[PDB]
């Protein structure tokens, strides 16, 4: 990895957002990005106040410089697509960090395991390409032939963790120089398992078996540790629909535009067009955030919070909400 300058931390250091709680539930990224016209460097800021705010990295020997390094270098690897972009995974990053503080979910989890899910959210997506799992293997693209061959269909999980591993393997943007021994080692499986659990196809499972450990006692306290880590960054990647209405629509927009462009690459290569992925179909945005809602985001949350996580319930209510609200634009439609 090359070096990040002295230039690339000022340009970042300059920002000083104001108006802006970057701790709050309210949090509007969308209007952060609009206040200026370096919004890279505002979501770098964003990402540098959040964890320099949490008061962990100082705890575990990252400096400053480290963080800021790491920081950039994560947004090096983030493309120019619609939705999973650098702008996705600071979402997460302040998103994960008001279920931690303010839905009291940081009473379940060590400081380090709060620290790697801060540091865990600006790795997961690195270098997507605004085309899904199914894409790769649909096509027999090279990167789909290499996961079907060694075994694992995680096909960019198993590379976002790839390129975040080549990120830490410097001391210079490693924010885990500081650990050594079984807290390095704990740091790194974590991060790595996060991220593989962020892949759709293994929902259902991710959730049951935290749903399970949860409710049992005497669950391993480990394992359950690394469940409530798993469960946090799902939360945070499908936490759209638990924003304000209007920040909902915006990501929305977003991942539907980035859909219908995996869709046109689809059908450019005569492979298999989902109907959420066919801009011919036109699909009405309330009746899809309606069945996104219904289908997964408020069962994953209902089931999480009434299980274990009980403050982080204002995310049901805004599910609740905004599904209302959808229902109204049909309403008057
Ligand atoms: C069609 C149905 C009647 C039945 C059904 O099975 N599903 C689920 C479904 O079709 N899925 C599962 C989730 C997948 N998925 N979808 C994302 C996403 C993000 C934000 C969205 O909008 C808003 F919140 F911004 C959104 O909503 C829109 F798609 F509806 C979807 C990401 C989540 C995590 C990782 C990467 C993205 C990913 O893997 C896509 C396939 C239904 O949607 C209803
Ligand atoms: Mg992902
Ligand atoms: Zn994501």
Not at 165 to 190: C, K
Request: proline share 3%.
């Amino acid at each position: 990895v090359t070096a990040i300058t002295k230039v690339e931390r000022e340009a970042v250091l300059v920002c000083e957002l104001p108006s802006f709680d970057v701790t709050d539930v309210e949090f509007d990224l969308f209007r952060a990005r609009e206040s200026t016209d370096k919004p890279l460097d505002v979501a770098a800021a964003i990402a540098y106040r959040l964890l320099l705010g949490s008061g962990l990295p100082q705890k575990f020997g990252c400096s400053d410089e480290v963080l800021l390094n790491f920081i950039l270098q994560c947004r090096k690897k983030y493309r120019n697509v619609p939705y999973h972009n650098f702008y996705h995974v600071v979402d997460v990053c302040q998103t994960i960090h008001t279920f931690l503080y303010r839905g009291n979910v940081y009473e379940k989890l060590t400081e380090l395991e709060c620290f790697v899910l801060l540091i865990t959210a600006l790795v997961h997506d690195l270098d997507h390409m605004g085309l899904n799992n199914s894409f790769y293997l649909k096509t027999e693209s090279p990167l789909g032939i290499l996961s079907s061959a060694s075994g694992n269909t995680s096909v960019l999980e198993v590379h976002h963790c790839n390129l975040a591993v080549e990120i830490l393997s410097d001391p210079e943007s490693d924010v885990f120089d500081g650990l050594e021994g079984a807290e390095r080692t704990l740091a790194f499986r974590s991060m790595i398992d996060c991220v593989l659990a962020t892949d759709m196809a293994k929902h259902g499972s991710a959730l049951e078996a935290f749903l399970a450990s949860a409710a049992d006692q005497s669950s391993d306290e480990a394992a359950f540790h690394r469940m409530t880590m798993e469960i946090i960054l799902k939360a945070g990647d499908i936490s759209n629909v638990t924003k304000p209405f209007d920040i909902s629509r915006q990501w929305a927009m977003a991942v539907t535009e980035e859909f219908y462009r995996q869709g046109d690459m689809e059908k450019e290569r005569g492979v298999e067009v989902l109907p959420m992925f066919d801009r011919s179909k036109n699909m009405e945005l309330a009746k899809g955030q309606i069945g996104f809602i219904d289908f997964v985001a408020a069962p994953f949350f209902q089931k999480i919070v009434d299980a274990c996580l009980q403050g982080m319930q204002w995310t049901v209510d805004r599910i609740k909400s905004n599904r209302a609200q959808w229902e109204r634009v049909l309403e008057t439609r």
